């Protein structure tokens, strides 16, 4: 019935019992969470301690409870505080909510440091964990087989590599006309979304060569690149 | 269809947020417009 047993099993001493409650909470975490938020601070203390090999599991559980309360912001932060088991969350259907929050946070910071150096993805401030969550999103997009999804999130975060990969994959030549349309949607959308000179330059240069490689593409779309960047070399 | 029912809360958050902003903006600008015209 109630959660009251579960709460008690944590507080009671000896390692084994504490370890056991974590698994128990996880089973009913979505169903029942009202009573378990009482003991939210305690769950956090078990993570700090290194004796449990299920510390990672302890951070994972608390984060589901925050999300459920209604506190989406509290959830993602806790999840990223630990930097443990975001992989599970990314591919979980019911909570793609806190994932959205992590994505929304990352793209802003990523934009700032792009101006400074084009690659900054493995820099100390932009934790490699953040880079990993982001690429997991890109794979989810192509699984639903929409590539607009994958493009649009990456333009916001000033990612040069991910965009380059996308344009390159459309060199399959599934059909030539059909490849051009997707490319044209991004060049119009660049004008408006991107205001940063450095990032804007870099992306148009890439797009020139991928188009240029197909001798079969319209030169209206190639013209459009030449004029925007307004480069004498292109 | 089944896949997209599950993955929806990523997408749904951002678009529904944005729409709410339009509803409150229109409301405000036209209320203040009436005040300005009278004075």
């Amino acid at each position: 019935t109630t959660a009251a047993p579960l709460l008690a099993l944590l507080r009671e001493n000896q390692d084994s019992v504490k370890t056991y409650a974590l698994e128990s909470i996880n089973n009913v975490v979505d169903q029942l969470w009202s009573e378990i938020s009482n003991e939210l601070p305690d769950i956090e203390a078990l993570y700090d301690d290194d004796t449990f090999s299920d510390r990672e599991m302890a951070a994972l559980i608390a984060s589901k409870v925050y999300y459920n309360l209604g506190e989406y912001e509290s959830a993602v932060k806790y999840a990223l505080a630990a930097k443990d088991r975001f992989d599970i969350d990314e591919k979980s259907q019911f909570v793609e909510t806190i994932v959205s929050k992590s994505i929304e946070m990352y793209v802003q910071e990523a934009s700032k440091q792009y101006t400074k150096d084009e690659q900054f993805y493995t820099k100390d401030i932009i934790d490699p964990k953040l880079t990993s969550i982001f690429e997991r999103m890109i794979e989810k997009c192509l699984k639903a087989s929409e590539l607009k999804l994958a493009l649009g999130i990456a333009l916001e975060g000033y990612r040069l590599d991910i965009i380059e990969s996308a344009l390159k994959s459309k060199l399959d030549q599934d059909s030539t006309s059909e490849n051009v349309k997707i490319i044209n949607y991004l060049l119009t959308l660049a004008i408006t979304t991107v205001t940063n000179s450095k990032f804007r330059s870099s992306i148009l240069r890439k797009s020139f060569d991928f188009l240029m490689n197909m001798p079969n593409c319209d030169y209206l779309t190639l013209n459009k690149v030449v004029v925007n960047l307004n480069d004498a070399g292109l | 269809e089944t896949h997209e029912s599950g993955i929806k809360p990523y997408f749904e958050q951002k678009i529904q947020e944005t729409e709410l902003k339009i509803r409150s903006k229109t409301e405000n600008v036209r209320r203040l417009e009436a005040q300005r015209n009278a004075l």
């Binding site: 639903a144 929409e146 607009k148 | 997209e4 678009i15």
Partner: peptide, 15 residues
Amino acid sequence: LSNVNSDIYFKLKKL
């Protein structure tokens, strides 16, 4: 509901 999701990236970002 695959259709709505696409529009967030394209149209609505500009608006």
